[PDB]
Amino acid sequence: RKKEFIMAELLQTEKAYVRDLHECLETYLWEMTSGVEEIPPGILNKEHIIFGNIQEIYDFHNNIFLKELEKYEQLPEDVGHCFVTWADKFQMYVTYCKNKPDSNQLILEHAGTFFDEIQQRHGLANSISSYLIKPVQRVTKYQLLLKELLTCCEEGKGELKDGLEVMLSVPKKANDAMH
Amino acid sequence: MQAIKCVVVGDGAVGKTCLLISYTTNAFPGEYIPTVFDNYSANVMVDGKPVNLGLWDTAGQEDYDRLRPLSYPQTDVFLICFSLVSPASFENVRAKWYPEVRHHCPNTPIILVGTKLDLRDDKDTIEKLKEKKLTPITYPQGLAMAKEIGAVKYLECSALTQRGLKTVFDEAIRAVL
Ligand SMILES: Cc1cc(NC(=O)NCC[C@](O)(c2ccc(C)o2)C(F)(F)F)no1
16 A cells, blocks of 8 residues: 555656656746747856756656656556666766756846746746756655655565665765765 | 745654645645655735745755755745754754755744654653653753744644644744745
8 A cells, every 4th residue: 555655656746747847948948949038148048057958857757767667657666676777867967966056056147037037927836946956856856755665565675775776876976976 | 926935954854745745735644645745836825915935845855965055045934844852853953954054045034843743742752762861852942942043933833733833834934024
């Protein structure tokens, strides 16, 4: 019963994470790359500093990772292996995390209310800042879900151990990569 | 209409995720305690004047000293939380939470929040602490710690019973108005 609740939250929050990144790319990023609106000279051709590699993280979760998590829905005790299979992909969170300070300063010092304007216009509850913290949140949450599964799965649970290892290694490597 | 970024910090033992879920759903989640609370916002009227309250969880970042501050910039008010039945979580307010919050956000209001108020008078909780030569954290300990860190308020709540819970978030808002 508990292992099924955890796996359900894992898939449900993954869907919302993919929805949230998608929303971020097609509002905040699109308005900058579109050519529909006047871009403050402070941030022009700097979308790369603002959004870092979030496009590539979204492509991972949207093209691969969510499809593969879905496949483990009836196999929660094995889902650790999903994280092992796709370990290399999570290294992009290291890149993303390194760039977040530079992203935040650039938006502070140089964007004035460009993004605030898009938020009002599109009717979004979440600021660009809310969206850009989410990869940092997500990459430190997988380890919590895996730990919860370890409390309610048998010793057919080295197919969690090694997944948890990966998802402890990625945020630690991200954390250790900061200034 | 005034928007407010409120960030919730403190040890895993405080029940950050549970606190926020129980506040926003108006109920202790009881059946299953979800590990995920995504950034939230809702309109609340305080002292008449309505306000948009934004809530960020930090659960999962407890071991990543350089990732935690990524959430801190442009925060309007912090809840620094400890569990009233974890002396260690209470000491970590002093050792860990207040320093990094001051370092990154020197002029931001702090509310000191004691969670798990419902467990302070619980026989099994009291006993399990007594075996480690400890006791729950009492009210004047909160007050003394609040003063030391420059907390604007010290508040005690339970997610389980909802005692003091709505008040925590009312005061976070009032600390910014
Ligand atoms: C945040 C936060 C959490 C909190 N209070 C609690 O979690 N109290 C309950 C802990 C407990 O496990 C539990 C969960 C559900 C039920 C009935 O009991 C126990 F059995 F001990 F009562 N107050 O603030």
